[PDB]
Design an enzyme around this catalytic site. Structure first.
Site, short mmCIF file in Angstrom:
data_model
loop_
_atom_site.label_atom_id
_atom_site.label_comp_id
_atom_site.label_asym_id
_atom_site.label_seq_id
_atom_site.Cartn_x
_atom_site.Cartn_y
_atom_site.Cartn_z
N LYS A 47 0.81 -1.22 0.00
CA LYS A 47 0.00 0.00 0.00
C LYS A 47 0.85 1.27 0.00
CE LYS A 47 -3.28 -1.13 -0.51
NZ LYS A 47 -3.50 -1.62 -1.90
N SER A 48 2.07 1.18 -0.53
CA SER A 48 2.98 2.32 -0.55
C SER A 48 3.20 2.89 -1.94
CB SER A 48 4.33 1.92 0.05
OG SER A 48 4.17 1.45 1.38
N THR A 50 3.02 0.61 -5.05
CA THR A 50 3.52 -0.40 -5.98
C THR A 50 2.89 -0.24 -7.35
OG1 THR A 50 3.36 -1.80 -4.01
CG2 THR A 50 4.21 -2.81 -6.04
N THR A 51 1.55 -0.20 -7.40
CA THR A 51 0.86 -0.10 -8.68
C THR A 51 1.21 1.19 -9.40
OG1 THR A 51 -0.96 -1.37 -7.71
CG2 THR A 51 -1.39 -0.22 -9.79
N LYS A 106 7.27 -6.98 -9.43
CA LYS A 106 6.71 -6.35 -8.25
C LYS A 106 6.82 -7.30 -7.06
CE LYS A 106 1.96 -5.86 -6.48
NZ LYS A 106 0.53 -5.88 -6.87
N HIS A 108 6.67 -7.34 -2.38
CA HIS A 108 6.58 -6.67 -1.08
C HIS A 108 7.53 -7.27 -0.05
CE1 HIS A 108 3.22 -4.47 -2.65
NE2 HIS A 108 2.42 -5.52 -2.69
N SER A 138 -4.49 2.55 4.49
CA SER A 138 -4.67 1.88 3.20
C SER A 138 -4.59 0.36 3.35
CB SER A 138 -3.62 2.37 2.21
OG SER A 138 -3.77 1.72 0.96
N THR A 227 -0.72 8.78 -15.28
CA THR A 227 -0.43 8.19 -13.98
C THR A 227 -0.92 9.06 -12.82
OG1 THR A 227 1.82 9.10 -14.00
CG2 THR A 227 1.50 6.88 -14.89
N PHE A 229 -3.83 9.92 -10.13
CA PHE A 229 -4.73 9.01 -9.43
C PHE A 229 -6.06 8.89 -10.16
CE2 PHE A 229 -8.27 8.49 -6.43
CZ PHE A 229 -7.98 7.23 -5.94
N1 LIG Z 1 -1.65 7.23 -9.42
C1 LIG Z 1 -1.83 7.20 -8.10
N2 LIG Z 1 -1.75 8.36 -7.41
C2 LIG Z 1 -1.93 8.34 -6.09
N3 LIG Z 1 -2.19 7.30 -5.30
C3 LIG Z 1 -2.26 6.16 -6.00
C4 LIG Z 1 -2.10 6.03 -7.37
N4 LIG Z 1 -2.25 4.70 -7.75
C5 LIG Z 1 -2.50 4.08 -6.62
N5 LIG Z 1 -2.52 4.90 -5.52
C6 LIG Z 1 -2.76 4.53 -4.13
O1 LIG Z 1 -1.72 3.68 -3.69
C7 LIG Z 1 -2.26 2.73 -2.74
C8 LIG Z 1 -2.03 1.33 -3.26
O2 LIG Z 1 -0.62 1.13 -3.12
P1 LIG Z 1 -0.16 -0.29 -3.74
O3 LIG Z 1 -0.22 -0.23 -5.35
O4 LIG Z 1 1.24 -0.52 -3.30
O5 LIG Z 1 -1.10 -1.48 -3.20
C9 LIG Z 1 -3.71 3.16 -2.53
O6 LIG Z 1 -3.60 4.24 -1.57
P2 LIG Z 1 -4.96 4.56 -0.78
O7 LIG Z 1 -5.50 3.33 -0.15
O8 LIG Z 1 -4.61 5.64 0.37
O9 LIG Z 1 -6.05 5.19 -1.78
C10 LIG Z 1 -4.06 3.76 -3.89
O10 LIG Z 1 -5.18 4.63 -3.85
#
Ligand SMILES: Nc1ncnc2c1ncn2[C@@H]1O[C@H](COP(=O)(O)O)[C@@H](OP(=O)(O)O)[C@H]1O
Length: 295
Positions: A47-48, A50-51, A106, A108, A138, A227, A229
């Site tokens: 949740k930092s 990755t995506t 990817k 963790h 998150s 990219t 959000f």
């Molecule tokens: N382009 C983007 N800009 C900002 N936050 C993004 C993003 N893409 C994903 N996120 C956020 O990154 C988190 C997911 O991280 P990961 O990909 O490592 O699982 C979620 O945070 P939140 O739960 O605070 O919305 C998601 O909303």
């Protein structure tokens, strides 16, 4: 069907680290994973970002063309190294074996249990840190909706598990600090989720340079545009809406939840924030690594 018995189970343990239950069996597939020196590893505590970073890396490798990135879901374009769904899907490691260089991996895993092959081959690691408070919010909501996870119970009990490192992939403190230090012996680009919310083009530029890629100003703007959000929440190729609801209950909490820095203020009680801050100052003593909880 076969994977059902692994869903919503308590964490297993691999090498002293709590692990998603479905991921833990057959762990030699991870320990013995065969990396290539051209591999790009996107490593994060859950949740930092990755995506987010994975989509940026993919876009840079496609010359900044967003159409190329819509050829498949991000979960298939960037397989998670340790992913497994026994009997339902092929593992992430098997998928990665059949992927042409440059592979984007990817993961963790904390630095000390990331497969040795990655360190020996000097693979370029892009690490993303995010402030522990937003990560905990998150991660909590992710666990409510992701059936691979042990159910988190109430937020206050989850937060206690989080501070103790009793959640999937273990201590956030050891995770972010482990990769911050390993850069003395390995090519690591250490990014900050908050730096990306503040100035996305500046961080894309740093990723491009690290990868040895040269972007026209048009490509850079195109990557910044797609990219955001908002671009990624509505893109079915990045928002995980293609994952069957049997595995990810998008109604409970969407993957693209809020995408901001500071949402922790809407969830941490006054007392939780006081206790977390003392523990954090204690646990983060003796490191120059700094996170921002607001921008
Ligand atoms: N382009 C983007 N800009 C900002 N936050 C993004 C993003 N893409 C994903 N996120 C956020 O990154 C988190 C997911 O991280 P990961 O990909 O490592 O699982 C979620 O945070 P939140 O739960 O605070 O919305 C998601 O909303």
């Amino acid at each position: 069907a076969t994977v059902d018995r692994y869903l919503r189970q308590p964490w297993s343990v691999v090498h002293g680290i709590p692990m998603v239950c479905a991921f833990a069996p057959n762990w030699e597939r991870v320990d013995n994973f065969q990396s290539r020196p051209e591999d790009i590893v996107v490593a994060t505590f859950p949740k930092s970002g990755t995506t987010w970073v994975s989509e940026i890396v993919d876009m840079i490798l496609q010359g900044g063309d967003p159409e190329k990135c819509k050829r498949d879901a991000i979960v298939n374009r960037v397989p998670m190294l340790e992913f497994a769904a026994p009997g339902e899907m092929p593992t992430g490691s098997e998928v990665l074996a059949t992927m042409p260089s440059p592979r984007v991996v990817k993961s963790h895993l904390p630095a000390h249990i990331l497969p040795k092959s990655f360190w020996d081959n000097g693979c370029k690691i892009i690490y993303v840190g995010r402030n522990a408070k937003d990560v905990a919010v998150s991660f909590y909501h992710f666990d409510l909706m992701n059936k691979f996870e042990q159910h988190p119970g109430t937020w206050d009990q989850y937060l206690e598990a989080f501070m103790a490192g009793k959640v999937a992939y273990g201590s956030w403190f050891d995770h972010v600090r482990g990769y911050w230090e390993r850069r003395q012996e390995h090519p690591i680009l250490y990014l900050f989720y908050e730096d990306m919310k503040e100035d996305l083009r500046r961080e894309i530029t740093k990723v491009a340079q690290f990868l040895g890629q040269e972007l026209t100003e048009v490509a850079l703007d195109a990557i910044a545009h797609h990219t955001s959000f908002e671009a990624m929440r509505d893109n079915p190729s990045t928002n995980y809406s293609t994952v069957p609801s049997h595995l990810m209950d998008h109604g409970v909490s969407p993957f693209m939840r809020k995408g901001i820095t500071g949402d922790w203020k809407n969830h941490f009680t006054v007392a939780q924030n006081a206790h977390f801050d003392q523990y954090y100052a204690q646990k983060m003593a003796g490191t120059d690594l700094r996170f921002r909880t607001e921008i």
